[model samples]
Target: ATFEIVNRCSYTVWAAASKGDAALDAGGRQLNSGESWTINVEPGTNGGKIWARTDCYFDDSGSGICKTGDCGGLLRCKRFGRPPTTLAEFSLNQYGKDYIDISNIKGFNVPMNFSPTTRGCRGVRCAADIVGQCPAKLKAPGGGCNDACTVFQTSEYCCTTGKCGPTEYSRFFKRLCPDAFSYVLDKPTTVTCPGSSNYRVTFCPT
Candidate 1:
């Protein structure tokens, strides 16, 4: 089954389960406001508390501000019976005035929020190889010129013949980090080197 939460506050909010006085377990983190999460539950066990806080940054500016009606919608942990099915769903408006959808949950007490450092890229450069690589050489124009350098994928060995083998970098990235969002260390370059530019793709939190 699946679970979801929404962020309805102007500022970010966080969510997590509680253990007695402690809201999160060791290494457990909170979900940002306007974000929702769902997880599977076992039957016959008492439902744990779902805690929320209106904090985004790592400062006290938005801490302990759990004002009335400043939380997300209800979180339903269904299917605690045989087969052990669970589903968590909520409406954007009902969850809160501001909320974001959650997806692909694993284990318990996992935190979800916007990382100020991460960014997303799409378009021609987003998926290309850097300085002759697999996708860049195969997809980009001029058959993978050794102009741009990419860290994600290895350099393309063939350019003139337009024959380059697939690199683990591109394959691994597409499989593991298929989301549209991406984080880069340096600002994107303006030059359109055949296989040395970045590419863009649509991404969302999962």
Candidate 2:
């Protein structure tokens, strides 16, 4: 299956996707608005995630920071980026289908849509303008919704040691975007599509 990453916003977005620890965009590329890049997957491909990094700062070495969605400040990220960033996640060939989800448990910096381009494959999206509507306590400094788990590292919010439920804080995201993973242990957010399906991940989707 092929994963097409599109930057639909008005600015350039440094996109990153990974399968295991290997980066799909290992060389690191900058995508201008309305532009897109694609990565092909094999039958055994372990589905990872795609995220957008906006307003990245690069020195002569091209090493600096991004205003949002930074993975250890490294251009080729081997791990997931920090919180307050939108994510498109999937698990290929699971239960005869591809498990998919757009999560906000880590939170949202930009809106995203994951469209399956294959037959029998379902699509998912989370395009709400979460910034302006973000709760005061869970607000992110870099312009996004920093999940309660990030803001308050308590057991009640983190679900670290035991079963934890949603708080008023967690409900904010779930209320606005029911399609996303709004809190810790948010199992209901997962969705599945047909196996061997290709996906189009669009950033800043209208």
Candidate 3:
């Protein structure tokens, strides 16, 4: 699979991707307003993830902290970023098909859109005003909406026992971004496309 990532927001953002031990696009890259990068993934890369780090500043040695989605303060992330960040997750060549989803289950920092660029695959987005309207108890410092599970950490919100449903907070998120995975067990949020499809992920997509 191939991915074309774009930073359409008015500010700068650092994008990161992780799939097993292979860090696509050097694990991370800086993109100013209107910048974009293309990444080619290794075949059968499962659990691939892409996200943006906001309000960051990396020095010459590529070490810095981001207000959202910081991966151990490294410019080239070797691990999944912290929460309160949107995610574009991928599972390629599974049963001869590709699975993708726009997930805000961790939280929401920026508006995001994910879709297949080569075909008519169902697209998913989380472009709601989640940050602005975040409930006080679920708000994260430095800007972002924390998931209810993160805020409460109870079995009901976190679904730790695999026997939970959406809560009031999760329902708020679902109402705003119906296409995104608002809770751990969100239904029909995953979209399938051809295994050979190329895709695009846009930040701050209007």
Candidate 4:
């Protein structure tokens, strides 16, 4: 599947993606407004994640810090980055279809849309003003909104016992972006399309 990531935010955004150990698009790339990056996933690539990092700068060596979605201060992330980042999750060619969704379980940094380029497939959008509306206690230091789990780290929020359900914090996000995965056990919002489908992930979608 071909995944196209677009940056519509006024400022620059660094895009990142991970599928297993392979860092798609070299793990990250700087994207100015109106710019985009495309990724080609091998068939059956599952558990892939795509996200955007804000307020970042990398030296020629590609090492830097991001206010949000920082991955060990490395531009090319070998593993999933820290949270408070909106994500596009997907599995391609699984059971002859591609399943995809937008997840806010880690909290939210920007509005997002994960939509198939092909027809007949549903699209998911999370374009709420979550950052501005974030509770003072759960707000990140630099920017972005933090989930209760990230801030409190208690079993109630983190689901340590594996039987946790939605809380007020999770409902906050769900209320704004019902199409997004608000919590770990959030009902599956996954959409499906033909295995040959391509998609576009847009940040700050209109």
- Relative to the true structure, how large is the alpha-carbon lDDT of every model? 0.25, 0.79, 0.89, 0.89
The per-prediction tally of clashing pairs is: 30, 0, 0, 0
- Model 4 over residues 21-69: C-alpha lDDT tens digits? 7776577888899998997767788888899999997888998899999
Worst 10 residues of 3 by lDDT: 18-27
Q: Which of candidates 1 and 4 reaches a greater TM-score?
A: 4
* TM values, all candidates: 0.23, 0.91, 0.96, 0.96
Candidates 2 and 4, the one with greater lDDT: 4
Q: Residue 32's C-alpha lDDT in candidate 3? A: 93
Candidate 4 versus truth, CA RMSD in Å, comes to 1.2
Q: Could you give candidate 2's per-residue lDDT for residues 1-206 as a string of tens digits?
A: 78888899998988877764777646255789899888775555566878888778766665778877887777766667777788888878775778888888777888898888777756778888888899888787776788888888888888887699888887887887888887767657776688778889998889
| Error of model 1, residue 146, in angstroms | 64
Model 4 — which ten-residue stretch has the worst lDDT? 19-28
True-structure lDDT of candidate 3? 0.89
Cα error, candidate 2, residue 177 (Å): 0.9
Predicted candidate 1 versus true structure: per-residue lDDT over 1-206, tens digit per residue: 11233444344534443322322222113444344454322221122233233322332333222221112221211111110001111112222121122111110112222211112322221222221333343322322211112222323521224454434433432333232112121122212112211111111223
* 175: Cα error in model 4, Å: 0.5
lDDT of 3 by residue, 1-206 (tens): 67999999999999999874668768999999999999887768899899998999889999989999998899988788888989999998898999999888889998999988987587788898999999999899877999988888899989999998988998989999999998888786899898878999999999
Worst ten-residue run, lDDT, model 1? Answer: 81-90
